Design a protein around this ligand. Structure first.
Ligand SMILES: [Mg+2]
Ligand SMILES: [Mg+2]
Ligand SMILES: [Mg+2]
Ligand SMILES: [Mg+2]
Ligand SMILES: [Mg+2]
Ligand SMILES: [Mg+2]
Ligand SMILES: [Mg+2]
Ligand SMILES: [Mg+2]
Ligand SMILES: [Mg+2]
Ligand SMILES: [Mg+2]
Ligand SMILES: [Mg+2]
Ligand SMILES: [Mg+2]
Ligand SMILES: [Mg+2]
Ligand SMILES: [Mg+2]
Ligand SMILES: [Mg+2]
Ligand SMILES: [Mg+2]
Ligand SMILES: [Mg+2]
Ligand SMILES: [Mg+2]
Ligand SMILES: [Mg+2]
Ligand SMILES: [Mg+2]
Ligand SMILES: [Mg+2]
Ligand SMILES: [Mg+2]
Ligand SMILES: [Mg+2]
Ligand SMILES: [Mg+2]
Ligand SMILES: [Mg+2]
Ligand SMILES: [Mg+2]
Ligand SMILES: [Mg+2]
Ligand SMILES: [Mg+2]
Ligand SMILES: [Mg+2]
Ligand SMILES: [Mg+2]
Ligand SMILES: [Mg+2]
Ligand SMILES: [Mg+2]
Ligand SMILES: [Mg+2]
Ligand SMILES: [Mg+2]
Ligand SMILES: [Mg+2]
Ligand SMILES: [Mg+2]
Ligand SMILES: [Mg+2]
Ligand SMILES: [Mg+2]
Ligand SMILES: [Mg+2]
Ligand SMILES: [Mg+2]
Ligand SMILES: [Mg+2]
Ligand SMILES: [Mg+2]
Ligand SMILES: [Mg+2]
Ligand SMILES: [Mg+2]
Ligand SMILES: [Mg+2]
Ligand SMILES: [Mg+2]
Ligand SMILES: [Mg+2]
Ligand SMILES: [Mg+2]
Ligand SMILES: [Mg+2]
Ligand SMILES: [Mg+2]
Ligand SMILES: [Mg+2]
Ligand SMILES: [Mg+2]
Ligand SMILES: [Mg+2]
Ligand SMILES: [Mg+2]
Ligand SMILES: [Mg+2]
Ligand SMILES: [Mg+2]
Ligand SMILES: [Mg+2]
Ligand SMILES: [Mg+2]
Ligand SMILES: [Mg+2]
Ligand SMILES: [Mg+2]
Ligand SMILES: [Mg+2]
Ligand SMILES: [Mg+2]
Ligand SMILES: [Mg+2]
Ligand SMILES: [Mg+2]
Ligand SMILES: [Mg+2]
Ligand SMILES: [Mg+2]
Ligand SMILES: [Mg+2]
Ligand SMILES: [Mg+2]
Ligand SMILES: [Mg+2]
Ligand SMILES: [Mg+2]
Ligand SMILES: [Mg+2]
Ligand SMILES: [Mg+2]
Ligand SMILES: [Mg+2]
Lengths: 195, 232
RNA sequence: UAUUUAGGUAGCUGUGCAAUUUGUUUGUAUUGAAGUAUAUAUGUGAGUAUAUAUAGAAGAAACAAAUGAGCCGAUCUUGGAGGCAGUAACAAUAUAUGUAUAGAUAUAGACUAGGGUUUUCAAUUUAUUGAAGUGAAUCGGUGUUAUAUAAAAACAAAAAAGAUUAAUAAUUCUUUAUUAAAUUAUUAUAAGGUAACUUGAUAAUGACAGUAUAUUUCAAUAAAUUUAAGAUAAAUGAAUUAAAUUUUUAACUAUGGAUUGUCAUGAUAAGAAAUAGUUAAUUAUAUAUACUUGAUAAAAAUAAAAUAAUUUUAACCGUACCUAUACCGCAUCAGGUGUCUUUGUAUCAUAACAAAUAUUUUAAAUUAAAGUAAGUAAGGGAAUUCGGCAAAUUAGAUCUGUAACUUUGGGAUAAAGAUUGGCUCUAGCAUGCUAGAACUUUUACUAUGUAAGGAAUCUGACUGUUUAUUAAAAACAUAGCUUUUUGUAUUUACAAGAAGUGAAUUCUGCCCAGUGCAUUUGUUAAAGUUGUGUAAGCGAAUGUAAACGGCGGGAGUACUAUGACUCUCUUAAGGUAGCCAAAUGCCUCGUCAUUUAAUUGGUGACGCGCAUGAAUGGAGCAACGAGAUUCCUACUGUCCCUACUUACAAUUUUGUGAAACCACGAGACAAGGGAACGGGCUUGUUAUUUAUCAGCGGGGAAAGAAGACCCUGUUGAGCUUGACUUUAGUAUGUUUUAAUAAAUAUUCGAAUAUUUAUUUAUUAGAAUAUAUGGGGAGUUUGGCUGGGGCGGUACAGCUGUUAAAAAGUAACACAGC
RNA sequence: UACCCACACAUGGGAUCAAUAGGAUACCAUAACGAUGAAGGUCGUAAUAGAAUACGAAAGUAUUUACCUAAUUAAUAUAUUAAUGUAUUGAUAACCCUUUGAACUUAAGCAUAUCAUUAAAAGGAGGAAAAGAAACUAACUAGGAUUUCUUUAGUAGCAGCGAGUGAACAAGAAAUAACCCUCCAUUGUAAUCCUUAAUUGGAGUUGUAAAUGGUUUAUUCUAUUAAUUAUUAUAGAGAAUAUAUUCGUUAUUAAUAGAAUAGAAUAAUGUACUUGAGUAGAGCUGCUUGGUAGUGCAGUUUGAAUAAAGGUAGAAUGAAAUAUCUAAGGUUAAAUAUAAUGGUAUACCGAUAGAAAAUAAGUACUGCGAAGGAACUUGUGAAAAUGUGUGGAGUUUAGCCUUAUUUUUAAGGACCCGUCUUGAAACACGGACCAAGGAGAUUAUAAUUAUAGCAAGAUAAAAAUAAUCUUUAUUAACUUGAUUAGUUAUAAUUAUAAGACCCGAAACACAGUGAACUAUACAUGUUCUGGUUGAAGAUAAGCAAGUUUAUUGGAAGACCAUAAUCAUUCUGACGUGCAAAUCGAUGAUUUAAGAUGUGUAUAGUGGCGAAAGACCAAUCGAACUGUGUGGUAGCUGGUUCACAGCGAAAUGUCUCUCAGGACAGCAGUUAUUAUUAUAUAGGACAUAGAUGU
């Protein structure tokens, strides 16, 4: 109306499978230049230590001794008359909501934390909580590495309650290298402003 | 009242706007050589265009004054200065005539497009790398250097010599240039169509100088004048 | 026991009659219920009861109930039918025997838009019913596009004759052709010419204005010849009509070395004439040149080639008929509607007539009046009239001749004179055109077509346009002149937006106090901070009148008279150059001259100009005008003063056959009173053909339309603005705004503000406050009144008179506050 | 012969009366659409076929279902590996939930206000929807989720405090029902979940957890089909035939489908300490409510505490006591509202009535389009208007009243009705004629009169087999306080509001349709013939740097005619016309700023315009169609049967008042009562007085 032309409608192309993967690359590239140039808070700056690439292999070779039963083994365990035969078996827990119950009740002895998680708020409180209960702790890179033990895809946290008698001396070797990187310098980790 | 003539003309330009060529020249890193191919004429404008050929590619450009078919010209940042060549602005001495000036680098051209109108250079300032140009409108404008431009006066001469002695001559001019012709004076109109209209005799009754403070549909007459009348 | 009371508009109350349905009780009817039409009785009246005729199936009364409960009117609603009235208005060719002989009016024929069976035939009387009829590889659509839906006229593979049907025919049939796709048989991979080029031997285009001149291709005329036709009382070197058979130039190449063409302009040492040769000659909508322009004259799909043969290979839709009596205007309507073709005489054409083709049947007449058209007029010649409105005169072609004025082109076809036939010859060359001569007559463009002329004034420069249906102009436009805004334009200052005057020549004077416009340094809101501070705008200063606009008055002074000169109130400045009783001057039919027998008219001079005047333009006329006004010459029934002839309607006959209007109109007048102009009422005077026909416009305050003028309404709408109340748009503050480092300033180590640099942000906005704001939106704009408006308030209080010896009382009446 | 009257017989038309396979209103049940292709449309099928009606190539009597149409080899999204699977899209005309949102009108003007949390318009679902388990109400001797009815109540309150508008607790009833996620659920073990014939392939520790059998028997209710019923009567409701018979009613069974209750049998049972953030609240700003200085909601800026805590308590802020509750996550039956579709009834209408339609009716017909939209049953045969026959008068007088057997004449009287008006037969308006239709009825709230039941008390409130009035007792409040027989119904009149006795404006808002006439821009096509005049350019011949004469050439918004076009004059013709703008003569016009076909673009506070307020479908200083709408009118017009009793004003005061209202005066109707006749008077007489014509 009023002597003005009719409205015009433009067209759009649907994105191809190469064009979608191409555009997501320039999104993650812009963020990596952004977050480094500003100053990040100290609670995130503590998550840069990975302890080594090599020292991870000694801890994961310990936990693979204690794997839980599979699905098909669980049904054959119930085919027997008495399900509980012999002593209690030593296992390895793998859940986030279950491990923070263990540390609050002081049952654990060694905790591994994956720094790979996105969103990042879920594990910000973990190294401080172990400090109040005097628990040694360590940080590994990827949560895929922790799922390789429990036959799962991704796993955030992982901890043991006890170990057998033969691997006692093998356990004390790990804690010494783990403590001098984190717990002996914990009071410095709160003060370091990443910039 | 009703919507007047001025607002109704602008919305008629949105239903069918006017079309022209906008000729621009390319950018090349070093000095090359090109040949003039032919000369043509467009519908709206009076100045003839020229088709040059750089690296087996044909572009369009405004023809300078002395140009014939088959001549050779050079384009580059450091070409020699002569008639029809296109060089950087810093090379030309003070007092010559240029006729296509880009505002910034690697642009087509902005200033001096029509036929018969040229600009002059007045100085060079080695501090801050700037030169002052003399626009055809008569105002001194300061230009940054390193823009490139073309040397010479444009063609088509002085068209405004002989008058439209007939009414039929002005009919074909405004029709090709897409303007409204003929025009009716606003005093002859009835007071619905225009503010000045109506009355028992043909007169205005209001001061014709109108400020720029007022809104857009109230602007008519001599808008925002600093002076009115013959000087002497 | 009314010997006493009884009219009555607006209005209030009481007693009663009519209609439809509901509860209870009583009763009628096929030897005849309800309805309808005529009588009789009865009631003061709304009404009721009975009798006779007709018709054929259901209806009445009493005690109580529920309401869509009683018509003469509303320019009331729907249906039926009158007067005027057989009136207005329309249609009306001849034959004693015929499917013919004559007369009369009208140009005719094809594609598209619209119509849809109207086509053809049969039977029964521009009707009704029933059958039959439309044939496609080459005729249209289906395809491409017009700078995010476009072409039956732009672009595009290909056909013509000759016959058949009651109706289709580039479509059926016969004869000779052409295109495309699928399968067969055969094969050159290059020769020749110095050159332009010739033959199987690829990579091209669709594709693009207007005007003038010269070619005479076809075709057509004209002539000759050969077959056929029709007419004349006669006569004629043999007439008239039809069919066919015939009637060198431009480029380029090789030699050559300096001239040569067109109706016009020319071409050549970047090689002329002359020779030898190779390509073509575009069929009139063509070819080659020239001329006009601030106009240079569309897109896209689209390509290959030698010779012969074959085919149940080439899909889908429309193909009848009408061009105006088969469309649109309510119709068989004097209106309107795209393109093309069409024979003969016609010395510029035009106009007119004839061909061709299509339609058509029967009242009277030497006689009315008044009409619509066409003719003629003795003597006078605008005396008629607002005005020569209407009519009349002039006119084609050849030869002489041509003024004032001028923008030097024009005026000009100025004005003013003379000639014109027919037949027989002579003289030129270009061979069908032009000069001259002799003879002759009831004298020559004139059947049709075809300018009256001259002298002045006002206004518009010119060609152009406009109120479809009362206005064609002096109105609008136009070139020309001038002012203004924008240097970050899909376009780029010789460009893009906004305004005024109106060609050329000559001019464009004075004023910035008022209102606007521009430029630059006292008053004024909110939000934030422990608290404090900071906005634009308004006001003030300076410019601007081809911005809106404006441009005075009084006194003395040189026989009378006048005042060059002087004095004086104020203000922004006090109308200069020019012009005039003009389209602008009330008094006013101003004063003088001239035009006429006579002039309120026309023209030339005068100016204390009610109220002239400079781009709101002043002065001015050469050319142009269906513009407005006056005078001479010619011409005439405009007039003195009217007369005669013809056609069409009218008067007379047959056929089809309406409308406006109508309280009642049955005869018409003089005076009276009356709502102050009667057809009817009151006193007087009067018509009459057996019941008519044709005219006429005195009256029926004749018919059309709930008056447009004027007033009222606490009824509206279009428009303007310094009316009231507000709002879109826009300008300026505050708060929200990526991080970092540094510098500077202002307040007290701290708080604010300003400014620079880097990349790690940068979709570009949001919420509030003040100002501007007829670009828009709502609404209002008292009463009284010797009609309304203008003037006053007799619209609130007080005293005396009007005012008539208790109280009460009017006027736009008196004298006042 | 014509004109007038009386009687008898025939035409014209469809009124009156009687009937009826049609309508209207109220109640009850149902509340079933669509990608497995809906609603609606176009074309076809009959042995002889047009309208109507039914049906799809299986086509005019348990399957098929031609072509368009959401119409789909698609679009917006999810899952698996470009292909395949899944879900949405359209119809509605009543009720329900959100968004947006007017004006006419009332205020005797109008601008805040009212109409109105309305009409129109858009989005989303079901047979019902929405709501629902206190971050409540109250001040008591205390109650207890939601919904609906009575009452509180036209009350508290809001508002140019004007016109007007307007709630809740308590009390009596209908119907009743409570629950689930959000932590650390036995870590001696994901015990879960989708898919595959298959731990087959996945999901999942950033946290998933979901007990299962439909076999049989009995009973009750609803819907649809099929069967038997006396001629005495568990059958007298009603229809049809003729002038004693049937269908049914009444009362019983069967079959199929669906729902509910109960019994018997088969399957199945572990552990569970969660409380809601860019929220609640502040500052500025706008809407809404009765909410008054938030009752509720939203934008921008700012933004808390976690049961040692937070919210509320009918004027504002700050503070204190006493009560009483715990927000910001989710589900939910019954009582309730109303169409299309099918049933049952009635103080409704009876063919100008009832729906527009007794149905070949949403049909014929009209408009470019949105849209508009009729007539007609069967028997009887009224009036208006006419024809034939017989009889009678006169030519100078229509019809009516009174008195008369000189009644088809005589003497007296007598202008045409309705209506405004001081005054009408008026030269003031409406009416040519007949039939049928046609206007103070209904509802809510008050008051007076008549009648009926009970009476210091009165009552059919909703429902099932309480409240209100006498009497809020006064006052703003404190301080204080006995008293005019009532209440419930039936009928008539008056006042206010509802369309409001009937018909009538110029206008305003909401939602849509048109450039076939006519206007402008852009693209593509077509546009007859003859003459006049003579600017540049060029050539020669003379005279002597030039200058006269003669040719050639064919420029211009130059001149003139035919065909075509327009419209100056006669103020010609016609003027219930040929024609809702035509015809004749006379005129103006010519290679252009022209004329014209088709295609694309511009729409109503908008477009187009060489400008006249011209044109936009016979309409234009704001087009056409439907709705709000029965818009408001202090202003014209009309208003339907008889008799009897009684009978006026045109004056005073106030009024944005002067064509209108209210109070006072004049009138009518009904009622009670006698020394208010020991009294009154538009009078007179006697006495005492007032006044300034
Ligand atoms: Mg005008
Ligand atoms: Mg205006
Ligand atoms: Mg003027
Ligand atoms: Mg009486
Ligand atoms: Mg009635
Ligand atoms: Mg009547
Ligand atoms: Mg009456
Ligand atoms: Mg009638
Ligand atoms: Mg006739
Ligand atoms: Mg026929
Ligand atoms: Mg034919
Ligand atoms: Mg043929
Ligand atoms: Mg055919
Ligand atoms: Mg044909
Ligand atoms: Mg035609
Ligand atoms: Mg005709
Ligand atoms: Mg005669
Ligand atoms: Mg004479
Ligand atoms: Mg004579
Ligand atoms: Mg005279
Ligand atoms: Mg006279
Ligand atoms: Mg004349
Ligand atoms: Mg002679
Ligand atoms: Mg003119
Ligand atoms: Mg006119
Ligand atoms: Mg004219
Ligand atoms: Mg005219
Ligand atoms: Mg003009
Ligand atoms: Mg001039
Ligand atoms: Mg000023
Ligand atoms: Mg000045
Ligand atoms: Mg003067
Ligand atoms: Mg003059
Ligand atoms: Mg005189
Ligand atoms: Mg005649
Ligand atoms: Mg008389
Ligand atoms: Mg008199
Ligand atoms: Mg007569
Ligand atoms: Mg009137
Ligand atoms: Mg009044
Ligand atoms: Mg108004
Ligand atoms: Mg206004
Ligand atoms: Mg008055
Ligand atoms: Mg209303
Ligand atoms: Mg009002
Ligand atoms: Mg009113
Ligand atoms: Mg009003
Ligand atoms: Mg409201
Ligand atoms: Mg329910
Ligand atoms: Mg629900
Ligand atoms: Mg309300
Ligand atoms: Mg859980
Ligand atoms: Mg039986
Ligand atoms: Mg809570
Ligand atoms: Mg009846
Ligand atoms: Mg009916
Ligand atoms: Mg008398
Ligand atoms: Mg009067
Ligand atoms: Mg009279
Ligand atoms: Mg009258
Ligand atoms: Mg009348
Ligand atoms: Mg009646
Ligand atoms: Mg009305
Ligand atoms: Mg509208
Ligand atoms: Mg001309
Ligand atoms: Mg006339
Ligand atoms: Mg539209
Ligand atoms: Mg006007
Ligand atoms: Mg019109
Ligand atoms: Mg009386
Ligand atoms: Mg009156
Ligand atoms: Mg009264
Ligand atoms: Mg006395």
């Amino acid at each position: 109306a009023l002597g003005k032309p009719k409205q015009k409608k433009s067209f759009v192309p649907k994105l191809t499978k190469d064009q979608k993967d191409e555009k997501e690359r320039l999104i993650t590239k812009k963020i990596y230049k952004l977050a480094y140039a500003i100053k990040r808070p100290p609670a995130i700056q503590q998550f840069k230590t990975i302890l080594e690439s090599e020292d991870c292999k000694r801890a994961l070779a310990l936990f693979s001794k204690y794997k839980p039963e599979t699905h098909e083994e669980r049904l054959e365990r119930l085919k027997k008359s008495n399900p509980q035969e012999g002593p209690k078996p030593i296992l390895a827990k793998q859940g986030l909501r279950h491990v923070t119950r263990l540390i609050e009740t002081k049952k654990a002895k060694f905790v591994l934390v994956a720094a790979d998680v996105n969103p990042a708020e879920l594990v910000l409180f973990i190294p401080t909580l172990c400090k109040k209960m005097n628990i040694p702790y360590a940080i590994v890179e990827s949560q895929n590495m922790l799922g390789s033990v429990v036959n799962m895809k991704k796993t955030t946290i992982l901890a043991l309650c006890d170990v057998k008698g033969e691997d006692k001396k093998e356990l004390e070797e790990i804690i010494k290298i783990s403590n001098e990187m984190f717990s002996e310098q914990y009071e410095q980790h709160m003060t370091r402003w990443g910039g | 009242g009703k919507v007047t003539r001025k607002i109704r003309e602008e919305t008629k330009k949105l239903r069918n706007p006017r079309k022209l060529s906008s000729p621009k020249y390319p950018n090349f890193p070093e000095t090359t050589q090109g040949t003039v191919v032919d000369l043509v004429h467009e519908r709206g404008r009076g100045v003839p265009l020229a088709h040059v050929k750089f690296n087996d590619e044909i572009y369009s450009l405004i023809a300078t004054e002395g140009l014939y078919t088959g001549q050779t010209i050079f384009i580059g940042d450091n070409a020699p200065i002569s008639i029809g060549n296109i060089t950087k602005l810093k090379n030309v001495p003070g007092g010559m005539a240029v006729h296509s000036i880009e505002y910034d680098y690697e642009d087509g051209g902005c200033v001096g497009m029509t036929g018969g109108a040229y600009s002059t250079v007045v100085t060079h300032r080695e501090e801050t790398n700037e030169t002052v140009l003399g626009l055809p409108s008569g105002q001194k404008k300061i230009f940054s250097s390193e823009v490139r431009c073309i040397v010479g006066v444009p063609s088509a001469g002085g068209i405004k010599e002989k008058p439209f002695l007939k009414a039929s001559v002005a009919h074909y001019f405004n029709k090709a240039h897409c303007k409204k012709w003929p025009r009716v004076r606003c005093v002859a109109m009835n007071p619905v169509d225009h503010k000045f209209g109506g009355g028992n005799h043909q007169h205005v009754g209001r001061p014709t100088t109108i400020s720029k403070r007022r809104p857009h549909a109230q602007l008519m007459g001599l808008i925002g004048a600093r002076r009115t009348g013959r000087v002497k």
